[PDB]
Amino acid sequence: AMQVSEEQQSLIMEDVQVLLPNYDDFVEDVLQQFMEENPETFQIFPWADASKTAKEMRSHPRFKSHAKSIGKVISDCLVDLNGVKKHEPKLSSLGAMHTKKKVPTELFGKLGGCILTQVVKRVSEAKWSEEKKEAWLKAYGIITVMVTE
Amino acid sequence: AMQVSEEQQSLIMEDVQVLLPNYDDFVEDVLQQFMEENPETFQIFPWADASKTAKEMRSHPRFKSHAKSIGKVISDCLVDLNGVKKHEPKLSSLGAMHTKKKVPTELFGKLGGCILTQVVKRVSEAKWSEEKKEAWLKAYGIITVMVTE
Ligand code: HEM
Ligand code: HEM
């Protein structure tokens, strides 16, 4: 039941289109808010420079490049949620970076709150809905499993 | 006095030539021994997979790629120790990865012991000497400062 309905896939694709024209900005907004709200990430991300604010980090090539990388895994999963197992072997080595010992498990929940917040910011008020909220949350759950397992 | 004598530069260049034909193997030998002797590096290197031995990690593309990266910084410094400040801005972002909080400071000493051990393994017994030992140790000290400061 790690499967989304066809209607959930479709609601997601409809927000992916809204996000596509500014997709890189969207993903950097997410990582910047995540780092603002969870300051311990400046010790977990090796490239993060603890003498700078998240917003100062946003200019750094290593912030941009980490956002582009997670941005790609998320994009590839969102666009075909049920067929996500095709990405299995290219993913593969993510598991070892995301163990409980390296990444405190409650940070996954936090990062999903940040994705949902930036999604709400880019989607129109008229289009956002409870059903979309549940489709994105379920989607985030599947992406989570791919990156940890 | 972060400066090596011309004679120390020259003793180093003479070992760099011995290492060049197998340089990548040499640097992977170093990282593999470092990870065998200091098991906590499997929590510090994010890509390291704690369910595997260092030697099993050696096959992984992320082990090979991390060894190639440190291998390049070391090579570039060794070949012109006194003029190392030319590399300053390409280095730059290494500092934030190597703070005391992210990397326990006594591990620098450990990693330098591993470089010296693999250097002794590749250099002939007839050529290795006390003066070379001191030239490499001093060289390692300068490379250390470049990567932390
Ligand atoms: C399901 C959500 C997540 C996705 C899709 C994701 C994606 C990725 C990807 C693709 C990489 C490898 C990037 C590269 O090769 O440079 C990565 C690395 C990493 N991630 Fe995640 N990640 C997620 C959750 C988290 C969380 C919550 C944290 C907490 C800080 C986190 C921390 C890390 C760390 C420490 C690494 C090695 C990171 C790095 O090397 O900068 N990840 N992630
Ligand atoms: C003077 C000796 C050292 C040199 C020349 C060196 C070199 C480098 C380089 C060039 C990088 C960036 C590679 C990249 O962009 O992917 C790096 C990252 C890193 N280094 Fe070092 N390093 C040294 C000492 C250490 C020590 C003793 C440790 C202890 C574990 C260490 C742990 C790390 C960590 C956690 C990172 C981020 C590493 C990674 O992202 O895998 N380094 N180092």
Tab-separated table of C-alpha atoms and ligand atoms in Angstrom:
chain	number	residue	atom	x	y	z
A	1	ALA	CA	0.000	0.000	0.000
A	2	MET	CA	3.200	2.071	-0.647
A	3	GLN	CA	1.218	2.865	-3.838
A	4	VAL	CA	-0.611	5.987	-4.792
A	5	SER	CA	-3.953	6.069	-6.533
A	6	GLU	CA	-4.035	7.230	-10.162
A	7	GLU	CA	-5.901	10.283	-8.966
A	8	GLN	CA	-3.028	11.082	-6.447
A	9	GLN	CA	-0.412	10.648	-9.267
A	10	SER	CA	-2.389	12.960	-11.373
A	11	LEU	CA	-2.827	15.673	-8.592
A	12	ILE	CA	0.971	15.520	-8.063
A	13	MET	CA	1.732	15.877	-11.821
A	14	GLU	CA	-0.522	18.860	-11.878
A	15	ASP	CA	1.697	20.519	-9.165
A	16	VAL	CA	4.906	19.369	-10.788
A	17	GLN	CA	3.917	21.484	-13.835
A	18	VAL	CA	3.417	24.572	-11.667
A	19	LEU	CA	6.858	23.940	-10.077
A	20	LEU	CA	8.823	23.100	-13.287
A	21	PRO	CA	9.516	26.636	-14.512
A	22	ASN	CA	11.125	27.544	-11.119
A	23	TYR	CA	12.080	24.018	-9.977
A	24	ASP	CA	15.660	24.811	-8.870
A	25	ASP	CA	14.595	27.916	-6.884
A	26	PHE	CA	11.845	25.748	-5.251
A	27	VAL	CA	14.256	23.048	-4.104
A	28	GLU	CA	16.821	25.671	-2.742
A	29	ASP	CA	13.883	27.347	-0.824
A	30	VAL	CA	13.222	23.963	0.764
A	31	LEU	CA	16.824	23.237	1.789
A	32	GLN	CA	17.300	26.826	3.079
A	33	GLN	CA	14.145	26.657	5.292
A	34	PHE	CA	15.161	23.118	6.435
A	35	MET	CA	18.573	24.443	7.556
A	36	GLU	CA	16.994	27.551	9.250
A	37	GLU	CA	14.606	25.469	11.311
A	38	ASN	CA	16.944	22.546	12.091
A	39	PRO	CA	20.304	24.098	12.961
A	40	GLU	CA	21.933	20.775	13.648
A	41	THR	CA	22.024	20.146	9.882
A	42	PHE	CA	25.037	22.470	9.763
A	43	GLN	CA	26.956	19.665	11.589
A	44	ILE	CA	25.335	16.825	9.503
A	45	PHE	CA	25.893	18.295	6.018
A	46	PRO	CA	29.690	18.263	5.708
A	47	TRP	CA	29.796	21.116	3.275
A	48	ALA	CA	27.680	23.403	5.459
A	49	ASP	CA	29.654	26.270	6.992
A	50	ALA	CA	28.524	26.861	10.527
A	51	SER	CA	29.880	30.497	10.551
A	52	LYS	CA	27.249	31.369	7.922
A	53	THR	CA	23.444	31.593	7.924
A	54	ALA	CA	21.418	29.217	5.647
A	55	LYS	CA	20.723	32.181	3.431
A	56	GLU	CA	24.416	33.014	3.197
A	57	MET	CA	25.006	29.281	2.366
A	58	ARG	CA	22.525	29.498	-0.488
A	59	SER	CA	25.137	31.365	-2.633
A	60	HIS	CA	27.739	28.579	-2.124
A	61	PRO	CA	28.292	26.157	-5.052
A	62	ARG	CA	28.084	23.174	-2.636
A	63	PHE	CA	24.612	24.280	-1.402
A	64	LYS	CA	23.457	24.692	-5.013
A	65	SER	CA	24.890	21.352	-6.055
A	66	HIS	CA	23.408	19.458	-3.050
A	67	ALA	CA	19.958	21.021	-3.787
A	68	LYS	CA	20.247	20.027	-7.536
A	69	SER	CA	21.026	16.396	-6.417
A	70	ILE	CA	18.190	15.952	-4.021
A	71	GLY	CA	15.992	17.893	-6.464
A	72	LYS	CA	16.630	15.202	-9.123
A	73	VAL	CA	15.817	12.188	-6.962
A	74	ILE	CA	12.636	13.870	-5.804
A	75	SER	CA	11.649	14.852	-9.447
A	76	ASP	CA	12.321	11.426	-10.776
A	77	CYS	CA	10.275	9.803	-8.063
A	78	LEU	CA	7.317	12.268	-8.214
A	79	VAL	CA	6.838	11.829	-11.902
A	80	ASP	CA	6.295	8.058	-11.608
A	81	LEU	CA	5.539	7.195	-7.952
A	82	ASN	CA	4.382	3.629	-8.420
A	83	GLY	CA	7.257	2.660	-10.744
A	84	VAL	CA	9.861	4.035	-8.351
A	85	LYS	CA	11.697	0.623	-8.152
A	86	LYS	CA	13.224	1.409	-11.653
A	87	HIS	CA	15.482	3.934	-9.866
A	88	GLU	CA	16.592	1.325	-7.207
A	89	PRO	CA	20.170	0.691	-8.467
A	90	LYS	CA	21.077	4.356	-9.275
A	91	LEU	CA	19.801	5.131	-5.678
A	92	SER	CA	21.474	2.173	-3.982
A	93	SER	CA	24.339	4.083	-2.261
A	94	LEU	CA	21.949	6.669	-0.643
A	95	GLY	CA	20.968	4.171	2.076
A	96	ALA	CA	24.406	4.342	3.718
A	97	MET	CA	24.250	8.131	3.903
A	98	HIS	CA	20.846	8.094	5.549
A	99	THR	CA	21.107	5.556	8.336
A	100	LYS	CA	19.614	6.385	11.843
A	101	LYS	CA	23.146	6.768	13.207
A	102	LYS	CA	24.056	9.370	10.562
A	103	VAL	CA	20.705	11.124	10.175
A	104	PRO	CA	18.370	11.459	13.154
A	105	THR	CA	15.186	9.846	12.021
A	106	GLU	CA	12.822	12.741	13.047
A	107	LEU	CA	14.571	15.008	10.531
A	108	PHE	CA	12.832	13.164	7.640
A	109	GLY	CA	9.468	14.431	9.029
A	110	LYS	CA	10.873	17.922	9.332
A	111	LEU	CA	12.193	18.019	5.774
A	112	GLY	CA	8.792	16.754	4.538
A	113	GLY	CA	7.146	19.681	6.355
A	114	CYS	CA	9.429	22.055	4.512
A	115	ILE	CA	8.657	20.522	1.058
A	116	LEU	CA	4.883	20.824	1.817
A	117	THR	CA	5.329	24.463	2.910
A	118	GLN	CA	7.220	25.498	-0.283
A	119	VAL	CA	4.675	23.508	-2.380
A	120	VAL	CA	1.850	25.515	-0.738
A	121	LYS	CA	3.747	28.694	-1.450
A	122	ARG	CA	4.043	27.965	-5.234
A	123	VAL	CA	0.573	26.372	-5.832
A	124	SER	CA	-2.436	28.779	-6.036
A	125	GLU	CA	-4.776	28.953	-3.041
A	126	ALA	CA	-7.688	27.908	-5.337
A	127	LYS	CA	-5.822	24.761	-6.360
A	128	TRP	CA	-4.397	23.558	-3.034
A	129	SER	CA	-6.652	21.120	-1.235
A	130	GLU	CA	-6.795	18.485	1.419
A	131	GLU	CA	-6.523	15.724	-1.241
A	132	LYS	CA	-3.395	17.318	-2.684
A	133	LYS	CA	-1.978	17.602	0.842
A	134	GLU	CA	-2.488	13.850	1.370
A	135	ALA	CA	-1.117	13.005	-2.126
A	136	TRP	CA	2.154	14.968	-1.366
A	137	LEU	CA	2.485	13.426	2.085
A	138	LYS	CA	2.077	9.952	0.718
A	139	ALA	CA	4.530	10.750	-2.107
A	140	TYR	CA	7.065	12.018	0.480
A	141	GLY	CA	6.703	8.751	2.409
A	142	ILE	CA	7.623	6.670	-0.701
A	143	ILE	CA	10.592	8.944	-1.539
A	144	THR	CA	11.712	8.474	2.090
A	145	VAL	CA	11.747	4.674	1.792
A	146	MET	CA	13.703	4.850	-1.483
A	147	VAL	CA	16.438	6.902	0.102
A	148	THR	CA	16.779	4.885	3.298
A	149	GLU	CA	16.179	1.264	2.165
B	1	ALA	CA	58.694	28.614	9.131
B	2	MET	CA	55.745	26.778	7.436
B	3	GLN	CA	58.365	26.585	4.636
B	4	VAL	CA	60.418	23.674	3.490
B	5	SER	CA	64.051	23.866	2.504
B	6	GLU	CA	64.913	23.439	-1.183
B	7	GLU	CA	66.551	20.172	-0.248
B	8	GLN	CA	63.233	18.954	1.409
B	9	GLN	CA	61.255	19.989	-1.754
B	10	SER	CA	63.676	18.095	-3.813
B	11	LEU	CA	63.581	14.880	-1.591
B	12	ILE	CA	59.754	15.005	-1.847
B	13	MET	CA	59.802	15.410	-5.676
B	14	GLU	CA	62.080	12.449	-5.847
B	15	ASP	CA	59.378	10.336	-4.036
B	16	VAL	CA	56.555	11.850	-6.035
B	17	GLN	CA	58.203	10.355	-9.164
B	18	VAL	CA	58.304	6.892	-7.589
B	19	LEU	CA	54.594	7.271	-6.660
B	20	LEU	CA	53.326	8.766	-9.981
B	21	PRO	CA	52.978	5.555	-11.993
B	22	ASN	CA	50.716	4.032	-9.258
B	23	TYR	CA	49.470	7.284	-7.670
B	24	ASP	CA	45.755	6.364	-7.513
B	25	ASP	CA	46.447	2.907	-5.998
B	26	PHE	CA	48.749	4.654	-3.433
B	27	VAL	CA	46.096	7.126	-2.307
B	28	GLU	CA	43.359	4.341	-2.053
B	29	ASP	CA	45.866	2.260	0.068
B	30	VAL	CA	46.109	5.251	2.392
B	31	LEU	CA	42.358	5.836	2.765
B	32	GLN	CA	41.699	2.074	3.196
B	33	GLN	CA	44.318	1.740	6.008
B	34	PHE	CA	43.012	5.005	7.587
B	35	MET	CA	39.469	3.557	7.688
B	36	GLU	CA	40.725	0.144	9.029
B	37	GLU	CA	42.586	1.731	11.912
B	38	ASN	CA	40.076	4.491	12.746
B	39	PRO	CA	36.641	2.869	12.572
B	40	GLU	CA	34.835	6.026	13.544
B	41	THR	CA	35.520	7.385	10.040
B	42	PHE	CA	32.647	5.193	8.840
B	43	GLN	CA	30.331	7.625	10.741
B	44	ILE	CA	32.292	10.784	9.639
B	45	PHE	CA	32.504	10.040	5.895
B	46	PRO	CA	28.857	10.212	4.811
B	47	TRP	CA	29.320	7.895	1.898
B	48	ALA	CA	30.981	5.180	3.982
B	49	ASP	CA	28.791	2.110	4.475
B	50	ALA	CA	29.171	0.812	7.981
B	51	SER	CA	27.916	-2.729	7.006
B	52	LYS	CA	31.056	-3.122	4.866
B	53	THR	CA	34.780	-3.421	5.618
B	54	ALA	CA	37.186	-0.687	4.327
B	55	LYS	CA	38.391	-3.172	1.766
B	56	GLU	CA	34.846	-3.866	0.608
B	57	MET	CA	34.365	-0.031	0.422
B	58	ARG	CA	37.391	0.266	-1.837
B	59	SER	CA	35.324	-1.088	-4.804
B	60	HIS	CA	32.615	1.598	-4.312
B	61	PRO	CA	32.635	4.559	-6.756
B	62	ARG	CA	32.272	7.004	-3.813
B	63	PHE	CA	35.432	5.604	-2.123
B	64	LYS	CA	37.324	5.886	-5.422
B	65	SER	CA	36.070	9.395	-6.063
B	66	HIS	CA	36.852	10.629	-2.503
B	67	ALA	CA	40.411	9.170	-2.795
B	68	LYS	CA	40.891	10.887	-6.253
B	69	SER	CA	39.820	14.244	-4.629
B	70	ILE	CA	42.083	14.148	-1.654
B	71	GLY	CA	44.783	12.679	-3.917
B	72	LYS	CA	44.658	15.853	-6.069
B	73	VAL	CA	44.938	18.367	-3.237
B	74	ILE	CA	47.842	16.423	-1.793
B	75	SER	CA	49.588	16.156	-5.270
B	76	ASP	CA	49.137	19.789	-6.011
B	77	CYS	CA	50.537	20.805	-2.666
B	78	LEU	CA	53.512	18.356	-2.678
B	79	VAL	CA	54.741	19.501	-6.024
B	80	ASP	CA	55.132	23.129	-4.888
B	81	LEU	CA	55.090	23.239	-1.058
B	82	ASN	CA	56.244	26.804	-0.564
B	83	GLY	CA	53.897	28.270	-3.200
B	84	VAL	CA	50.881	26.506	-1.722
B	85	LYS	CA	48.973	29.851	-1.244
B	86	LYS	CA	48.227	29.800	-5.071
B	87	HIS	CA	45.699	27.021	-4.327
B	88	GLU	CA	44.005	29.080	-1.498
B	89	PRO	CA	40.756	30.024	-3.328
B	90	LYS	CA	40.114	26.608	-5.012
B	91	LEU	CA	40.628	25.115	-1.452
B	92	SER	CA	38.575	27.716	0.406
B	93	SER	CA	35.455	25.566	1.081
B	94	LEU	CA	37.508	22.663	2.622
B	95	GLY	CA	37.847	24.557	5.922
B	96	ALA	CA	34.147	24.138	6.744
B	97	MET	CA	34.339	20.384	6.209
B	98	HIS	CA	37.324	20.026	8.503
B	99	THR	CA	36.434	21.972	11.618
B	100	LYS	CA	37.178	20.438	15.127
B	101	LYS	CA	33.448	19.869	15.621
B	102	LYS	CA	33.165	17.857	12.385
B	103	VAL	CA	36.559	16.144	12.369
B	104	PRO	CA	38.227	15.181	15.645
B	105	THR	CA	41.543	16.918	15.541
B	106	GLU	CA	43.701	13.829	16.449
B	107	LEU	CA	42.564	12.137	13.228
B	108	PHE	CA	44.829	14.477	11.183
B	109	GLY	CA	47.854	12.892	12.968
B	110	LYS	CA	46.491	9.440	12.279
B	111	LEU	CA	45.945	10.071	8.575
B	112	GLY	CA	49.502	11.483	8.350
B	113	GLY	CA	50.793	8.222	9.858
B	114	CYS	CA	48.996	6.305	7.150
B	115	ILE	CA	50.439	8.470	4.303
B	116	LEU	CA	53.977	7.946	5.759
B	117	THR	CA	53.389	4.173	5.999
B	118	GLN	CA	52.229	3.826	2.341
B	119	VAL	CA	55.113	6.136	1.254
B	120	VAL	CA	57.575	3.786	3.023
B	121	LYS	CA	55.935	0.850	1.320
B	122	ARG	CA	56.420	2.314	-2.224
B	123	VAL	CA	59.905	3.920	-1.759
B	124	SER	CA	62.939	1.538	-1.799
B	125	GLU	CA	64.606	0.730	1.525
B	126	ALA	CA	67.910	2.144	0.138
B	127	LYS	CA	66.233	5.470	-0.613
B	128	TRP	CA	64.121	6.025	2.512
B	129	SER	CA	65.899	8.014	5.185
B	130	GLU	CA	65.430	10.073	8.276
B	131	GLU	CA	65.661	13.307	6.214
B	132	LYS	CA	62.938	12.094	3.865
B	133	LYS	CA	60.821	11.152	6.891
B	134	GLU	CA	61.132	14.716	8.241
B	135	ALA	CA	60.503	16.260	4.771
B	136	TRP	CA	57.187	14.255	4.431
B	137	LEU	CA	56.111	15.095	7.970
B	138	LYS	CA	56.723	18.761	7.429
B	139	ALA	CA	54.930	18.585	4.054
B	140	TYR	CA	51.939	16.887	5.753
B	141	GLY	CA	51.822	19.703	8.319
B	142	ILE	CA	51.527	22.373	5.557
B	143	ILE	CA	48.847	20.371	3.687
B	144	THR	CA	46.985	20.142	7.023
B	145	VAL	CA	46.933	23.926	7.477
B	146	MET	CA	45.707	24.438	3.895
B	147	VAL	CA	42.746	22.173	4.440
B	148	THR	CA	41.703	23.529	7.827
B	149	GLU	CA	42.450	27.289	7.579
C	1	HEM	C1	13.512	11.685	1.444
C	1	HEM	C2	14.176	12.840	1.549
C	1	HEM	C3	15.658	12.912	1.129
C	1	HEM	C4	16.144	12.861	-0.100
C	1	HEM	C5	15.387	12.621	-1.434
C	1	HEM	C6	17.589	13.016	-0.030
C	1	HEM	C7	18.499	12.974	-1.108
C	1	HEM	C8	19.879	12.883	-1.005
C	1	HEM	C9	20.787	12.655	-2.063
C	1	HEM	C10	20.350	12.375	-3.542
C	1	HEM	C11	21.996	12.650	-1.556
C	1	HEM	C12	23.350	12.382	-2.296
C	1	HEM	C13	23.788	13.676	-2.945
C	1	HEM	C14	25.213	13.606	-3.455
C	1	HEM	O1	25.658	12.635	-4.055
C	1	HEM	O2	25.964	14.581	-3.241
C	1	HEM	C15	21.901	12.944	-0.165
C	1	HEM	C16	22.941	12.995	0.733
C	1	HEM	C17	22.834	13.338	2.080
C	1	HEM	N1	21.730	13.612	2.820
C	1	HEM	FE1	19.871	13.374	2.023
C	1	HEM	N2	17.905	13.176	1.264
C	1	HEM	C18	16.769	13.157	2.032
C	1	HEM	C19	16.720	13.293	3.440
C	1	HEM	C20	17.749	13.717	4.253
C	1	HEM	C21	17.636	14.293	5.606
C	1	HEM	C22	16.317	14.506	6.394
C	1	HEM	C23	18.831	14.680	6.004
C	1	HEM	C24	19.198	15.320	7.398
C	1	HEM	C25	20.197	16.210	7.426
C	1	HEM	C26	19.739	14.321	4.954
C	1	HEM	C27	21.102	14.414	5.052
C	1	HEM	C28	22.028	13.950	4.136
C	1	HEM	C29	23.471	13.748	4.350
C	1	HEM	C30	24.352	13.987	5.580
C	1	HEM	C31	23.937	13.327	3.013
C	1	HEM	C32	25.377	13.094	2.560
C	1	HEM	C33	24.781	14.537	2.379
C	1	HEM	C34	25.876	15.207	1.797
C	1	HEM	O3	26.786	14.375	1.460
C	1	HEM	O4	25.769	16.450	1.780
C	1	HEM	N3	19.038	13.773	3.891
C	1	HEM	N4	20.600	13.062	0.130
C	2	HEM	C1	45.427	17.159	5.397
C	2	HEM	C2	44.780	16.020	5.132
C	2	HEM	C3	43.420	16.063	4.406
C	2	HEM	C4	43.200	16.365	3.137
C	2	HEM	C5	44.214	16.847	2.064
C	2	HEM	C6	41.776	16.229	2.872
C	2	HEM	C7	41.110	16.501	1.657
C	2	HEM	C8	39.738	16.599	1.486
C	2	HEM	C9	39.066	17.050	0.327
C	2	HEM	C10	39.796	17.606	-0.944
C	2	HEM	C11	37.779	16.980	0.561
C	2	HEM	C12	36.603	17.417	-0.377
C	2	HEM	C13	36.337	16.286	-1.345
C	2	HEM	C14	35.049	16.484	-2.117
C	2	HEM	O1	34.719	17.563	-2.594
C	2	HEM	O2	34.291	15.502	-2.261
C	2	HEM	C15	37.586	16.417	1.856
C	2	HEM	C16	36.384	16.212	2.489
C	2	HEM	C17	36.214	15.609	3.734
C	2	HEM	N1	37.145	15.171	4.620
C	2	HEM	FE1	39.123	15.522	4.292
C	2	HEM	N2	41.200	15.824	4.014
C	2	HEM	C18	42.150	15.668	4.991
C	2	HEM	C19	41.907	15.257	6.323
C	2	HEM	C20	40.740	14.704	6.803
C	2	HEM	C21	40.580	13.871	8.010
C	2	HEM	C22	41.710	13.480	8.998
C	2	HEM	C23	39.336	13.439	8.066
C	2	HEM	C24	38.700	12.544	9.199
C	2	HEM	C25	37.737	11.688	8.842
C	2	HEM	C26	38.660	14.016	6.941
C	2	HEM	C27	37.310	13.934	6.732
C	2	HEM	C28	36.586	14.588	5.752
C	2	HEM	C29	35.126	14.774	5.696
C	2	HEM	C30	34.012	14.317	6.643
C	2	HEM	C31	34.940	15.460	4.400
C	2	HEM	C32	33.622	15.807	3.711
C	2	HEM	C33	34.273	14.416	3.379
C	2	HEM	C34	33.338	13.897	2.461
C	2	HEM	O3	32.501	14.797	2.112
C	2	HEM	O4	33.472	12.679	2.223
C	2	HEM	N3	39.556	14.747	6.177
C	2	HEM	N4	38.800	16.216	2.387
